[PDB]
């Protein structure tokens with residue numbers, strides 16, 4: 001289902017959480033498959049932001065929650081695999097694939113993502129995922145800018 | 147390039163704190179050369195490069211040929227790295243690159259998160275993640291061919 005890329009690191013520590021903040025980010029990655037905005041919002045600070053970089057940002061925990069609730073109305077996150085995780089200066093970075101299934105069409109796509117997370121006292125204060133939107137949209141037959 | 151609300155204003159934010167980070171920031175400075183021959187010197191023979199919306203290039207020659215093609219169609223006019231970090235042999239850069247499409251004269255500020263793998267100071271992998279369509283629409287050139 002998710003295959004291992006040729007460029008995957010051979011350093012085990014590169015694929016494992018190596019700090020307390022990295023551990024929380026991997027727990028959050030595991031939780032994504034719940035498709036549950038109310039569960040996921042508990043990982044967030046009140047003063048926070050979320051952006052899927054092809055689309056506009058959400059600022060503040062309520063906007064974040066409302067975005068996730070909309071997302072999970074249209075798609076399921078069926079699987080997440082994080083190949084690489086690392087961190088510096090209060091930012092955690094994840095190189096991953098998320099398997100996304102469009103609820104209106106039944107079609108799925110393996111989306112390659114590089115994301116960044118800012119944690120303050122173990123809660124998410126920023127989350128930005130970078131990826132290409134058009135290939136995903138074309139694969140699952142749903143225009144994801146509206 | 148103006149500063150995002152979310153970008154750190156810390157004096158150290160996008161500054162290198164390791165040898166590998168230092169090499170990556172030198173590489174970022176070198177991108178505005180638009181010079182594939184200059185850039186390829188940063189790479190190991192066993193390497194790869196991918197702009198993630200498009201297919202990867204494997205091996206140093208393929209990487210060089212990709213860069214030479216890239217610089218035939220666009221200029222990287224500026225690069226600003228907001229955040230840099232690293233662990234376990236990988237370096238990450240959150241940046242904006244200002245790209246100008248030579249056929250049309252139009253520019254776009256492209257938001258990118260990239261990852262670099264280094265072995266003995268040379269690049270064994272470079273992957274940049276971003277949205278291609280928004281860029282294509284802004285500069286009037288179909289970037290998948």
Ligand SMILES: CCCCCCC(N)=O
Nearest residue numbers: 052055077098100129144
């Ligand atoms: C708006 C579509 C983007 C959803 C990607 C969600 C994810 N992180 O897998």
Ligand SMILES: CCCCCCC(N)=O
Nearest residue numbers: 197200222243245274289
């Ligand atoms: C296919 C277009 C991608 C070019 C991005 C180059 C860069 N890193 O600024």
